[PDB]
Amino acid sequence: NFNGLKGTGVLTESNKKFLPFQQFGRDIADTTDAVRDPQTLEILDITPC
């Protein structure tokens, strides 16, 4: 739960190129697939269980 970003699954490590103003990540199915942690500045990827 990162500021209302509730979900269920594992959080693997992703290293895709983003923009400083771009923190969210969506997909074709309009689901939150890639996220940026709010405290620390790395990138996580939601993968289901």
């Binding site: 997909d27 074709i28 199915a29 689901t31």
Partner: protein, 35 residues
């Protein structure tokens, strides 16, 4: 990534007959009708 976004329960199953066996049947029919 349109093929790999199938996390939402949408699976594609392979056919029982593979391409090599289908081609072998095709060659068998061709041989039977030529010789």
């Amino acid at each position: 990534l349109i093929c790999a976004q199938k996390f939402k329960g949408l699976t594609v199953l392979p056919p029982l007959l593979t391409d090599e066996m289908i081609a072998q049947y095709t060659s068998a029919l061709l041989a039977g009708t030529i010789t």
